Ligand binder design. Structure first.
Ligand code: HEM
Ligand code: HEM
Ligand SMILES: [C-]#N
Ligand SMILES: [C-]#N
Ligand code: NA
Lengths: 127, 126
């Protein structure tokens, strides 16, 4: 954990400073409340098992930010290919992520930092 | 609370200045009495959970006035989007808020200061 990494003189990851796996679980749950109540986005998840998705997305986000847990889901490009997702849709999703993070009390400088890991992903996500 | 924040040498916020979460609860309560009695605004709130709206609006105001807790609701543009709210409507709402702050005993200078935090939010709301 964070304690073990500190004794190895490893720098503190984004994962660690926001609160590890438990913090990410709570953010992702609020994230999807937001995304599904947005009628610009809801129709994308019409045939989606949401419990399974939040499972994979907690895994993906935790790995992207420095966590030790493996991502067990499918490649980003493969999943989002041909779903008609534009940059408008990506930006709206990204916006709900920032909103979720803000609501969990994450400092805004750290949120900007997370958006910087996330923004490049649009290349695989969008059409 | 305010006592904790003064021992951390945080300057006094509008939130703590006007009386904290409890004082804003009382203001927002009287605020929507004024809004729902105004014929120019009443119809927007037909079929809305007022209890739930109150909770979110207290949370918003508290955070806009420099309080300790994050706003956890929806952004101002998204929530008010597609509702046809005009500057005339926003101004009536801000006037009702000013009048509730007055009734609560908040000094004129601090209401003016609160309206300076609020007024810019019209870009999003309208
Ligand atoms: C912001 C960057 C994004 C990340 C990090 C992300 C992450 C993920 C992950 C981990 C999965 C699960 C893959 C699997 O099942 O193996 C997934 C699936 C999915 N994504 Fe995203 N995603 C992003 C953006 C978007 C956007 C912008 C949309 C459209 C608005 C979208 C729509 C979907 C849908 C509908 C599924 C599930 C399909 C299904 O199985 O029903 N994603 N995403
Ligand atoms: C003074 C600036 C204003 C602030 C700070 C404000 C704040 C808020 C907040 C926090 C919410 C709830 C967001 C959520 O559910 O997550 C909301 C919703 C709403 N507001 Fe405002 N608002 C303002 C001005 C106005 C104006 C001018 C109108 C119309 C005349 C209006 C009418 C509404 C309506 C109809 C809702 C939706 C309630 C529902 O969920 O059905 N607000 N507002
Ligand atoms: C993926 N949402
Ligand atoms: C909300 N008013
Ligand atoms: Na509409």
């Amino acid at each position: 954990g964070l304690l073990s990494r500190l004794r190895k003189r490893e720098p503190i990851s984004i994962y660690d400073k926001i609160g590890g796996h438990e913090a990410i679980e709570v953010v992702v749950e609020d994230f999807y409340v937001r995304v599904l109540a947005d009628d610009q986005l809801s129709a994308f998840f019409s045939g989606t098992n949401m419990s399974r998705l939040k499972g994979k997305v907690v895994e993906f986000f935790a790995a992207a930010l420095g966590g030790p847990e493996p991502y067990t889901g499918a490649p980003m490009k493969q999943v989002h290919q041909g779903r008609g997702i534009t940059m408008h849709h990506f930006s709206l999703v990204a916006g709900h992520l920032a909103d979720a993070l803000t609501a969990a009390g994450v400092p805004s400088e750290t949120i900007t930092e997370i958006l910087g890991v996330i923004a490049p992903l649009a290349v695989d996500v969008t059409s």
